[PDB]
Amino acid sequence: LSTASVLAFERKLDPSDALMSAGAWAQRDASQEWPAVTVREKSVRGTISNRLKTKDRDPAKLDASIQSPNLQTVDVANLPSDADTLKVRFTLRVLGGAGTPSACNDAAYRDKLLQTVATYVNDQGFAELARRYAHNLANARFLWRNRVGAEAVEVRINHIRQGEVARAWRFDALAIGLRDFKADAELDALAELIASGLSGSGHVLLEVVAFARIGDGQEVFPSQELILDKGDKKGQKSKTLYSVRDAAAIHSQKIGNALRTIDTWYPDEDGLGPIAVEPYGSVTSQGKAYRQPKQKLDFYTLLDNWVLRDEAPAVEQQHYVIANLIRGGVFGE
Amino acid sequence: LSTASVLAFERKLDPSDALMSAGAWAQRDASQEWPAVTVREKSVRGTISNRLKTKDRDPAKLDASIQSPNLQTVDVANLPSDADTLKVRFTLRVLGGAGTPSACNDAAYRDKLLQTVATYVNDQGFAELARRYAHNLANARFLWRNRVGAEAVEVRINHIRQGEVARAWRFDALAIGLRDFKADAELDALAELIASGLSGSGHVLLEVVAFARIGDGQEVFPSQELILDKGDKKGQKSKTLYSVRDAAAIHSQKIGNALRTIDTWYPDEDGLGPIAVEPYGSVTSQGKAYRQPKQKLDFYTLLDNWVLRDEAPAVEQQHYVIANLIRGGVFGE
Amino acid sequence: VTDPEALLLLPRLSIQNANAISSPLTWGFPSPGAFTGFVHALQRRVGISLDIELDGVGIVCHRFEAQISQPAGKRTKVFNLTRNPLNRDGSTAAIVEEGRAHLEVSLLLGVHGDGLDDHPAQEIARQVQEQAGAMRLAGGSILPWCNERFPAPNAELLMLGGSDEQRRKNQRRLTRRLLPGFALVSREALLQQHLETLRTTLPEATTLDALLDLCRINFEPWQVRDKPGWLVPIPAGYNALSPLYLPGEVRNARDRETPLRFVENLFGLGEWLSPHRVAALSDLLWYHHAEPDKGLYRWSTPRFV
RNA sequence: CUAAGAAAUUCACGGCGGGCUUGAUGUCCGCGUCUACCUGGUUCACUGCCGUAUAGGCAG
């Protein structure tokens, strides 16, 4: 039983692009006709304040470079001057059937994989993963920098069966902690909804709406696009911002990054906090790669040792492996 | 312990775009329905007042060059003819947590940095920096050229907790000096508010409104936008002005420049006055760069000598370094 | 190539994050093969369980916005990529490139089976829509329902039976819901005509493709050549070079049970139209036929004219 | 069973100083609009009367 040379898992928990529209607090229940936050341009005259070396450095170029202003054109997005509330709306499907790959060479390896995943689900449900997913929808992880420094953040979650609303939840994101996964009755209800969705026992479509008090005319933070920077033509403009038809927006994979911050099971340090689930579990901003393959906690090592050789790891590492199967990806050689 | 190759500090003291609306003095307490100052066009015929080399300047070339057209179209912003008071309104958040970077490679360098900043805060508070910030909100630095030649300038500052007003301050900008940081009871109260904001002990949102007597129908000074005369047909404008939806305005980074004029600790001359806090502390208008790296007073040199080697500088230079951390920026290689 | 009895219509399918590369030489709106292969995937998920048969697909393409960029005043375009996770080691990776679109399209279909006698129309259309709502249409996700679920009810129309007044009547009832969109067909007989026109010098067809969709400025002894329509180059099939292989021969296949060849695409001409030019809407669906004795594959709409 | 399957771009900024656009002027001449009509929509499936429970002398 060698590994399959081709493996591919389609993702579950598929979000959409979040839209931002600004308005006034306590006009909050009628947040349906609020105008969108537009992305505009402004010019910026700054000084050169980076680090400058000492090798091949004529001091005429140095002092000529420091003592001269820099000109540049950026994009900003601000609230209107008579509005102090950011509204961020997106939707979320929960597909289910999180064991079946979409492409596999071997037939014995695929049947062994389905017996392993079905053994996991029959031993214990999806209650842990849906509890942590419910905590990431409870607070406002998907408000990345917009959450930082806010008076009150309110999250409203709706469940949709038809052109209707089945059950509505209304949370408070600042009371719910950022690092402490504490239980609650409503989070157990919504965790039963998501856990009922991932098991394939129904169709789950959720509508998530987030509200934040920032201030009158302050700055919101959409996601930033690529200027490829291939050699020549750096261009006058800088910091272009992502958008939809005349509205600022956030990419879908960034919200999808914010939902799957589960992993509190690093070998190195459990004191920092949960950072998101990746094979070779890494953080791009910190420049570090936790969960090294020189250890025995990598996803590929645990999956090989748990499918091929029946060496079941600890329970929390099994939550890690099934979390990587809900993530999906391109596996195999 | 080498330096981190990636460092980035998000800014604190985040302002917004200031709006200008004109009205009448002693109708000053009802300054809520005042109409905005609009930006309009007018035509201007130029002249010849530039230097000449007198290597291609014949006496016939001057008369031929003042036969020539210097025709031009500019933007102006004036008060209405029955109003003599400029109103400038903006808001200001004070975030706090001014030691934690947003991106860092090393984990030991980041912990050493947090021990250094926490050592600074535990040795002495944020009272000095919030005192100088309180003096820059006290007078009208953020009225750049609009302050010059005015009868009376009045600044009103509000603190906001809810849809309410917690405590209101009313100052007099001409009595408070431009260069002399003298203490006061109200400035100690507002300096306790800002110092309580930067330490992370609460949420601070301020509303700043400025009033200036200029004259009936005089000229106000919004901030100027970037245009580039390239090769197109029939000419274009030569002076655009920044605006919002049908109102003249000032950029947010220019008010942010006016708030952080702290630095009275130049090696060269303390007789000129405080000019704003920059690494390689420079003035773009004067074309000079104070605080050279050939000395030992640069931000990068003091930060390297105070984090890596425990060589603590003088106290006022420590105020400079922490002022650069409240400024934020892109540091490292 | 078999004419369908019904024409099932999916009203407003909005793709998020599509694939706007589609070929090594054309750029924009994706291939017809994604839109036919989606229908065969519905045939593998629904049509064997409701005893129906889905063969073709009708592209309508109401909306299209590609994530592109044009800086520095140049008259060419670049892309808007995304990030990837870090290196295997922990530094950074290389950058591959991928197209992108926010598409919205309506799809005609074609039904052959006996499920109409066993099930009513709203049941069939409801099952097909509520299976297509959990799939991925052209390499990107399908946006679920919102406040714009108001056009989301389907339609279904038997084509053979009934009087001709009901045929043209209900046909015009269909084409008032495909009303802002622009249909897409294949027009290779025009390419044979332009080969016979430019057959004075050289009968090559790829240089004809390079000399159809472009602004020909012909000077006077300057006159822009009049375009006879909104023509566009599309990929139109595969023309396999390698002989066929047994299943357990090539390492790194998808599965070890179906044969293999190495293919390349095959470039053809297509045309965007208004839906009111079409005589009968059953002459619009994209089929694909084959003859694997040789390497000759194509998507087509036979009998359009 | 879709050129199938997967993915965080991030951090910071002062555009600013000065100006004379001028001078002169003919919009002119002429003209056939005309024949015919039922608003009664319900300008509210109605507007004020013994019982706040469907029973009525109503101006209808």
From Swiss-Prot, chains A, B:
Coiled coil: none annotated. It comes from the Bacteria. The keyword Amino-acid biosynthesis does not apply. It holds the Pfam family Cas_Csy3. Keywords: Antiviral defense. One of its GO terms (biological process) is defense response to virus. Disruption phenotype: Mutants lose phage DMS3 infection-dependent inhibition of biofilm formation while there is normal biofilm formation in the absence of phage infection. Decreased production of crRNA in the presence or absence of phage. Disruption of the entire Y.pestis-subtype CRISPR region disrupts crRNA production but does not alter phage resistance (possibly OLNs PA14_33350 to PA14_33310, and the flanking CRISPR loci), indicating this CRISPR is not involved in phage resistance. In this bacteria, Y.pestis-subtype CRISPRs do not confer resistance to phage DMS3 or MP22, but instead are required for DMS3 infection-dependent inhibition of biofilm formation and possibly motility. Part of the Csy ribonucleoprotein complex with a probable stoichiometry of Csy1(1),Csy2(1),Csy3(6),Cas6/Csy4(1)-crRNA(1). A Csy3(6),Cas6/Csy4(1)-crRNA(1) subcomplex is also formed. CRISPR (clustered regularly interspaced short palindromic repeat) is an adaptive immune system that provides protection against mobile genetic elements (viruses, transposable elements and conjugative plasmids). CRISPR clusters contain sequences complementary to antecedent mobile elements and target invading nucleic acids. CRISPR clusters are transcribed and processed into CRISPR RNA (crRNA). Cas3 and Cascade participate in CRISPR interference, the third stage of CRISPR immunity (Potential). Involved in crRNA production or stability. Belongs to the CRISPR-associated Csy3 family. This is CRISPR-associated protein Csy3. The gene is csy3.
Curated annotation (Swiss-Prot), chain C:
Keywords: Antiviral defense. Pfam families: Cas_Csy2. InterPro entries: CRISPR-assoc_prot_Csy2 (IPR013398). The keyword Repressor does not apply. CDD domains: Csy2_I-F (cd09736). Disruption phenotype: Mutants lose phage DMS3 infection-dependent inhibition of biofilm formation while there is normal biofilm formation in the absence of phage infection. Loss of production of crRNA in the presence or absence of phage. Disruption of the entire Y.pestis-subtype CRISPR region disrupts crRNA production but does not alter phage resistance (possibly OLNs PA14_33350 to PA14_33310, and the flanking CRISPR loci), indicating this CRISPR is not involved in phage resistance. GO terms for biological process: defense response to virus. NCBIfam families: cas_Csy2. Belongs to the CRISPR-associated Csy2 family. In this bacteria, Y.pestis-subtype CRISPRs do not confer resistance to phage DMS3 or MP22, but instead are required for DMS3 infection-dependent inhibition of biofilm formation and possibly motility. CRISPR (clustered regularly interspaced short palindromic repeat) is an adaptive immune system that provides protection against mobile genetic elements (viruses, transposable elements and conjugative plasmids). CRISPR clusters contain sequences complementary to antecedent mobile elements and target invading nucleic acids. CRISPR clusters are transcribed and processed into CRISPR RNA (crRNA). Cas3 and Cascade participate in CRISPR interference, the third stage of CRISPR immunity (Potential). Absolutely required for crRNA production or stability. Interacts directly with Csy1; part of the Csy ribonucleoprotein complex with a probable stoichiometry of Csy1(1),Csy2(1),Csy3(6),Cas6/Csy4(1)-crRNA(1). A Csy3(6),Cas6/Csy4(1)-crRNA(1) subcomplex is also formed. This is CRISPR-associated protein Csy2.
